[PDB]
């Protein structure tokens, strides 16, 4: 009700703060960082989330520094940011009301399967945001279904939560206990710290596969139990596999559970061939997010007529930028279909 008025710097553009007014603040989430609110900007009527972190006062916020570099339609945009209170950094973000987690669980609670057309849309917009994120050498490191925001009506997916993303410095090592356990790549559990952006892709597989199965593919009861779960679907990792993951542990030996069966009968051939492609031991083996997009599974989305179950056209899926294409520029004719040139 009470309209709060702050002095806020636009997320992008020149550092020139404006008076921004918002009201109807309610809490919609919280964690170690702090709290997320939903508010209504008084002047555009538009809804926003406000992530209230806690700023090390005498330290530069990594998330803030990362959000500013970022403008992509499948990523929650940092519209503004301000400070308040000792001292809290506030990120004013796009609000989107649903998450893949919550959608995936409604289906699962009702023992149905999320329509493959939604799996496609959502996974594609996910590989997109990462192709973009990774082109800057920024690893998300918490790719999990509740960091995927969805618009029920328009089928837009926006990646959110960069509260543990990092500009990866090759030659520079990092922390290995990151990601949500179920979505955490094997090398991470192995103690690797020399890792790459492939870890995000493993998380995507973990998602892809959970959308298909209606439950987490690898559900460990702890950091270490996690690898036991991966193991029972892929088997054990071998020389160049463990090599590739990290240059200790103590587990048991198990056989390679065939893919085209880890799921259910009606599951599409390409989706299965996707995961097998993602969910891979060696990290150089996992496909690239851009390269992922390319792969068949998403072909239906390259069909000129495709529409949303509710008869609307698909959200804008081909508005690529060269910044977005940077990684692998020679592959547009198979990512941009004619009808969008
Ligand atoms: C953590 C964290 N970092 N960003 C967010 C964030 C940002 C923008 C956002 O817009 C809507 C949400 C959102 C908040 C709560 C929910 S609940 C679990 O259904 C769903 C969606 C949101 C969350 O959360």
Coordinates of C-alpha atoms and ligand atoms in Angstrom, one line a residue:
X1 CA 0.0 0.0 0.0
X2 CA 2.5 2.6 1.2
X3 CA 4.4 3.9 -1.8
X4 CA 8.2 3.7 -1.2
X5 CA 10.3 6.1 -3.3
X6 CA 14.0 5.3 -3.8
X7 CA 16.9 6.9 -5.8
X8 CA 17.9 4.2 -8.2
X9 CA 20.5 3.7 -10.9
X10 CA 19.4 2.2 -14.2
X11 CA 20.7 -1.4 -14.7
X12 CA 22.3 -0.5 -18.0
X13 CA 23.1 2.9 -19.6
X14 CA 24.9 5.8 -17.9
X15 CA 25.3 5.8 -14.0
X16 CA 22.6 8.5 -13.5
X17 CA 20.1 7.7 -10.7
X18 CA 16.4 8.5 -10.9
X19 CA 13.6 8.7 -8.4
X20 CA 11.7 5.4 -8.7
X21 CA 8.4 4.8 -6.9
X22 CA 6.9 1.4 -6.0
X23 CA 4.3 0.0 -3.8
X24 CA 2.5 -3.4 -3.0
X25 CA 5.7 -5.0 -1.7
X26 CA 5.4 -8.6 -0.5
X27 CA 8.0 -11.2 0.1
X28 CA 8.1 -13.9 -2.5
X29 CA 11.3 -15.6 -1.5
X30 CA 14.5 -15.8 0.7
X31 CA 17.9 -17.3 1.2
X32 CA 21.5 -16.7 2.5
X33 CA 21.8 -13.4 0.4
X34 CA 18.5 -12.0 1.7
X35 CA 15.0 -11.7 0.3
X36 CA 13.1 -11.3 -2.9
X37 CA 10.0 -9.1 -3.1
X38 CA 7.3 -8.5 -5.7
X39 CA 6.4 -4.8 -6.2
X40 CA 4.4 -2.7 -8.6
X41 CA 6.2 0.3 -10.1
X42 CA 3.8 3.2 -9.6
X43 CA 4.4 4.8 -13.0
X44 CA 4.3 1.9 -15.5
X45 CA 2.0 -0.2 -13.3
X46 CA 4.5 -2.9 -14.2
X47 CA 5.4 -5.7 -11.7
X48 CA 8.9 -6.3 -10.6
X49 CA 10.9 -8.4 -8.2
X50 CA 13.3 -6.7 -5.8
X51 CA 16.1 -8.9 -4.6
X52 CA 17.4 -7.4 -1.3
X53 CA 20.9 -8.7 -0.8
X54 CA 23.3 -7.5 1.9
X55 CA 26.3 -5.6 0.6
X56 CA 29.7 -6.1 2.1
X57 CA 29.8 -2.3 2.3
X58 CA 33.5 -2.2 1.6
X59 CA 33.3 -4.8 -1.2
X60 CA 32.1 -4.9 -4.8
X61 CA 29.1 -7.1 -5.4
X62 CA 29.8 -9.7 -8.0
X63 CA 26.2 -10.3 -8.9
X64 CA 25.5 -6.7 -9.4
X65 CA 28.6 -6.3 -11.5
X66 CA 27.5 -9.3 -13.6
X67 CA 23.8 -8.2 -14.1
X68 CA 24.9 -4.9 -15.6
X69 CA 26.7 -6.6 -18.4
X70 CA 23.5 -8.5 -19.3
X71 CA 20.6 -7.8 -21.7
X72 CA 18.9 -10.9 -23.1
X73 CA 15.2 -11.8 -23.4
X74 CA 15.7 -15.1 -21.7
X75 CA 17.3 -13.5 -18.7
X76 CA 15.6 -11.6 -16.0
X77 CA 16.8 -8.1 -16.7
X78 CA 18.3 -5.8 -14.1
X79 CA 16.1 -2.8 -14.6
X80 CA 17.4 -0.7 -11.7
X81 CA 19.4 -1.1 -8.6
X82 CA 19.6 0.9 -5.3
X83 CA 20.9 0.8 -1.8
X84 CA 19.2 1.0 1.6
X85 CA 18.9 0.0 5.2
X86 CA 23.6 -1.7 7.8
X87 CA 23.6 -1.7 4.0
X88 CA 21.6 -3.7 1.4
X89 CA 22.0 -3.8 -2.3
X90 CA 18.6 -4.0 -4.1
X91 CA 18.3 -5.5 -7.6
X92 CA 15.1 -4.4 -9.3
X93 CA 14.4 -7.2 -11.8
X94 CA 11.9 -8.5 -14.2
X95 CA 9.2 -10.3 -12.4
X96 CA 7.8 -13.4 -14.0
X97 CA 5.3 -15.4 -12.0
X98 CA 6.0 -19.1 -12.5
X99 CA 8.9 -21.4 -12.5
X100 CA 9.6 -24.6 -14.2
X101 CA 10.0 -26.2 -10.8
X102 CA 6.4 -25.5 -10.0
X103 CA 5.1 -26.3 -13.4
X104 CA 7.0 -29.6 -13.5
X105 CA 5.6 -30.6 -10.1
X106 CA 2.0 -29.9 -10.9
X107 CA 2.2 -32.3 -13.7
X108 CA 4.1 -34.8 -11.6
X109 CA 1.7 -34.4 -8.7
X110 CA -1.1 -35.2 -11.1
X111 CA 0.9 -38.0 -12.7
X112 CA 1.0 -36.5 -16.2
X113 CA 3.9 -35.5 -18.3
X114 CA 4.8 -31.9 -19.3
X115 CA 4.0 -31.6 -23.0
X116 CA 7.2 -32.1 -25.1
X117 CA 6.3 -28.9 -26.9
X118 CA 6.8 -27.1 -23.6
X119 CA 9.9 -29.1 -22.9
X120 CA 11.3 -27.9 -26.2
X121 CA 10.4 -24.3 -25.7
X122 CA 11.8 -24.2 -22.2
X123 CA 15.0 -26.1 -22.9
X124 CA 15.7 -24.0 -26.0
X125 CA 15.2 -20.7 -24.3
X126 CA 17.5 -22.2 -21.6
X127 CA 20.3 -23.2 -24.0
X128 CA 19.9 -19.7 -25.5
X129 CA 20.5 -17.8 -22.2
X130 CA 23.6 -19.9 -21.6
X131 CA 25.0 -19.5 -25.1
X132 CA 24.7 -15.8 -24.3
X133 CA 26.0 -16.1 -20.7
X134 CA 28.9 -18.3 -21.7
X135 CA 29.9 -16.1 -24.6
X136 CA 31.0 -13.6 -21.9
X137 CA 32.7 -16.4 -20.0
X138 CA 30.1 -16.1 -17.2
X139 CA 29.1 -19.4 -15.7
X140 CA 25.7 -19.6 -14.0
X141 CA 26.5 -22.4 -11.6
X142 CA 23.0 -22.9 -10.2
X143 CA 21.1 -24.0 -13.2
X144 CA 18.2 -25.8 -11.6
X145 CA 14.4 -25.8 -12.3
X146 CA 13.6 -23.1 -9.8
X147 CA 15.9 -20.7 -11.4
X148 CA 13.9 -20.9 -14.6
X149 CA 11.1 -18.3 -14.6
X150 CA 8.2 -18.8 -16.9
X151 CA 5.2 -16.8 -18.2
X152 CA 2.2 -19.2 -18.2
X153 CA 0.5 -17.3 -21.0
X154 CA 3.4 -16.4 -23.3
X155 CA 5.8 -19.3 -22.7
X156 CA 8.7 -17.0 -22.2
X157 CA 11.4 -18.5 -20.0
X158 CA 13.8 -16.2 -18.2
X159 CA 16.9 -17.5 -16.4
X160 CA 17.2 -15.9 -13.0
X161 CA 19.4 -15.8 -9.9
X162 CA 23.0 -15.0 -10.5
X163 CA 23.9 -15.0 -6.8
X164 CA 26.5 -17.5 -7.5
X165 CA 27.4 -16.9 -11.1
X166 CA 31.1 -16.1 -11.8
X167 CA 33.1 -14.7 -14.6
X168 CA 35.4 -17.7 -15.0
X169 CA 39.1 -16.9 -15.1
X170 CA 40.8 -19.8 -17.0
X171 CA 44.1 -20.5 -15.2
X172 CA 42.1 -19.5 -12.2
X173 CA 40.4 -22.2 -10.1
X174 CA 37.0 -22.1 -8.3
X175 CA 34.9 -23.5 -5.5
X176 CA 33.7 -27.1 -6.2
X177 CA 30.7 -27.3 -3.8
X178 CA 28.3 -25.2 -5.9
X179 CA 25.1 -25.9 -7.8
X180 CA 22.1 -27.7 -6.5
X181 CA 23.1 -31.2 -5.5
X182 CA 20.8 -32.9 -8.0
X183 CA 22.0 -30.7 -10.8
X184 CA 25.7 -30.7 -9.8
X185 CA 28.1 -32.1 -12.4
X186 CA 30.3 -35.0 -11.6
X187 CA 33.6 -33.2 -11.6
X188 CA 32.3 -30.7 -9.0
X189 CA 31.6 -33.6 -6.6
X190 CA 35.0 -34.9 -7.6
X191 CA 36.6 -31.8 -6.1
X192 CA 37.6 -30.2 -9.5
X193 CA 38.2 -26.5 -9.4
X194 CA 39.7 -26.1 -12.9
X195 CA 36.3 -26.5 -14.4
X196 CA 34.5 -24.8 -17.3
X197 CA 31.0 -23.7 -18.4
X198 CA 30.2 -27.3 -19.2
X199 CA 29.0 -27.6 -15.6
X200 CA 25.9 -25.5 -16.6
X201 CA 25.1 -27.7 -19.5
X202 CA 25.3 -30.8 -17.2
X203 CA 22.7 -29.0 -15.1
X204 CA 20.6 -28.5 -18.2
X205 CA 20.7 -32.2 -19.0
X206 CA 19.6 -32.7 -15.4
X207 CA 16.6 -30.5 -16.2
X208 CA 15.9 -31.9 -19.7
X209 CA 15.9 -35.3 -18.2
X210 CA 13.8 -34.3 -15.2
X211 CA 11.2 -32.8 -17.5
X212 CA 11.0 -36.1 -19.3
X213 CA 11.0 -38.4 -16.3
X214 CA 8.8 -36.3 -14.1
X215 CA 11.4 -36.5 -11.3
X216 CA 15.1 -35.6 -10.7
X217 CA 17.3 -38.0 -12.7
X218 CA 20.0 -38.1 -10.0
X219 CA 18.6 -37.6 -6.6
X220 CA 21.4 -38.0 -3.9
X221 CA 20.7 -37.7 -0.2
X222 CA 24.0 -35.8 0.1
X223 CA 26.9 -34.3 -1.7
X224 CA 28.6 -37.6 -1.9
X225 CA 25.6 -39.8 -2.3
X226 CA 24.9 -37.7 -5.4
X227 CA 27.7 -39.4 -7.4
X228 CA 26.3 -42.8 -6.5
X229 CA 23.1 -41.7 -8.2
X230 CA 24.9 -40.5 -11.4
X231 CA 26.9 -43.7 -11.3
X232 CA 23.9 -45.9 -11.4
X233 CA 22.7 -44.5 -14.7
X234 CA 26.0 -44.0 -16.5
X235 CA 28.0 -46.6 -14.7
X236 CA 31.6 -45.8 -13.5
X237 CA 33.8 -43.1 -15.0
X238 CA 37.1 -44.4 -16.6
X239 CA 40.7 -43.2 -17.0
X240 CA 40.2 -40.3 -19.5
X241 CA 36.8 -39.7 -17.9
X242 CA 38.1 -39.1 -14.4
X243 CA 41.2 -37.6 -16.0
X244 CA 39.0 -35.1 -17.9
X245 CA 37.0 -34.2 -14.8
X246 CA 40.0 -33.3 -12.6
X247 CA 43.7 -34.2 -12.1
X248 CA 41.1 -39.5 -3.5
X249 CA 37.5 -40.8 -3.5
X250 CA 36.3 -44.4 -2.8
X251 CA 33.2 -45.8 -4.5
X252 CA 31.9 -49.1 -6.0
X253 CA 31.9 -50.4 -9.6
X254 CA 28.7 -50.3 -11.8
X255 CA 27.5 -51.0 -15.4
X256 CA 26.5 -48.5 -18.1
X257 CA 22.7 -48.3 -18.0
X258 CA 21.6 -47.9 -21.6
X259 CA 20.0 -44.5 -22.4
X260 CA 17.2 -45.2 -24.8
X261 CA 15.5 -46.9 -21.7
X262 CA 16.4 -44.8 -18.7
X263 CA 13.1 -43.0 -19.4
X264 CA 9.7 -44.1 -20.6
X265 CA 8.5 -45.7 -23.9
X266 CA 6.7 -42.7 -25.4
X267 CA 9.8 -40.4 -24.9
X268 CA 11.0 -38.9 -28.2
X269 CA 14.2 -40.3 -29.8
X270 CA 16.1 -37.0 -30.1
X271 CA 15.4 -35.9 -26.5
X272 CA 17.1 -39.1 -25.3
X273 CA 19.9 -38.4 -27.7
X274 CA 20.0 -34.9 -26.3
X275 CA 20.7 -35.9 -22.6
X276 CA 23.2 -38.7 -23.6
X277 CA 24.8 -35.7 -25.3
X278 CA 24.5 -33.4 -22.2
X279 CA 24.8 -35.6 -19.0
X280 CA 28.4 -36.8 -20.0
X281 CA 31.3 -37.7 -17.9
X282 CA 34.1 -35.9 -19.7
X283 CA 33.2 -32.2 -19.6
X284 CA 34.7 -31.4 -23.0
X285 CA 32.2 -34.0 -24.3
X286 CA 29.0 -32.3 -23.2
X287 CA 27.6 -30.2 -26.1
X288 CA 27.7 -26.4 -26.2
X289 CA 24.5 -24.5 -25.4
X290 CA 24.6 -23.0 -28.8
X291 CA 25.4 -26.5 -30.3
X292 CA 22.5 -27.8 -28.1
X293 CA 20.0 -25.5 -29.7
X294 CA 21.2 -26.7 -33.1
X295 CA 20.4 -30.4 -32.3
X296 CA 17.2 -31.8 -33.8
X297 CA 15.0 -32.1 -30.7
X298 CA 14.2 -28.4 -31.2
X299 CA 13.3 -28.7 -34.9
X300 CA 9.6 -28.4 -34.3
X301 CA 10.4 -24.9 -33.1
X302 CA 12.0 -24.1 -36.4
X303 CA 8.7 -24.9 -38.2
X304 CA 7.2 -21.6 -39.6
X305 CA 3.7 -22.4 -38.3
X306 CA 4.4 -23.7 -34.8
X307 CA 2.0 -22.2 -32.2
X308 CA 1.5 -22.3 -28.5
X309 CA -1.1 -24.7 -27.2
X310 CA -3.3 -21.7 -26.5
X311 CA -3.1 -20.7 -30.2
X312 CA -0.6 -17.9 -29.8
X313 CA 2.6 -17.7 -31.7
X314 CA 5.8 -18.8 -30.0
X315 CA 7.8 -16.1 -28.1
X316 CA 10.5 -14.6 -30.1
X317 CA 13.0 -17.4 -30.6
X318 CA 15.3 -16.3 -33.5
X319 CA 16.1 -12.7 -32.6
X320 CA 19.8 -13.6 -32.2
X321 CA 22.7 -11.2 -31.8
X322 CA 26.2 -11.6 -33.1
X323 CA 27.2 -11.3 -29.4
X324 CA 24.9 -14.2 -28.8
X325 CA 26.3 -16.1 -31.9
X326 CA 29.9 -15.1 -31.1
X327 CA 30.9 -18.6 -29.9
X328 CA 30.2 -20.3 -33.2
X329 CA 29.1 -17.8 -35.9
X330 CA 29.1 -20.3 -38.7
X331 CA 25.8 -22.1 -37.9
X332 CA 23.1 -19.5 -38.3
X333 CA 21.4 -21.1 -41.4
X334 CA 20.5 -23.9 -39.0
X335 CA 19.5 -21.7 -36.1
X336 CA 17.8 -18.9 -38.1
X337 CA 15.1 -20.3 -40.4
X338 CA 14.3 -18.2 -43.5
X339 CA 11.0 -16.9 -42.1
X340 CA 12.8 -14.8 -39.6
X341 CA 15.3 -12.8 -41.7
Ligands
LIG1 C1 17.2 -16.0 -5.6 C2 16.8 -15.1 -6.8 N1 17.5 -14.4 -7.6 N2 16.6 -13.7 -8.5 C3 15.4 -14.1 -8.1 C4 14.1 -13.7 -8.7 C5 14.2 -12.7 -9.7 C6 13.1 -12.3 -10.4 C7 11.9 -12.9 -10.1 O1 10.6 -12.7 -10.7 C8 9.7 -13.7 -10.1 C9 10.4 -14.5 -9.2 C10 9.8 -15.6 -8.4 C11 9.8 -15.5 -7.0 C12 9.3 -16.5 -6.3 C13 8.7 -17.6 -6.9 S1 7.9 -18.9 -6.0 C14 9.2 -20.2 -5.5 O2 6.9 -19.6 -6.9 C15 8.6 -17.6 -8.3 C16 9.2 -16.6 -9.1 C17 11.8 -14.0 -9.2 C18 12.9 -14.4 -8.5 O3 15.5 -15.0 -7.0

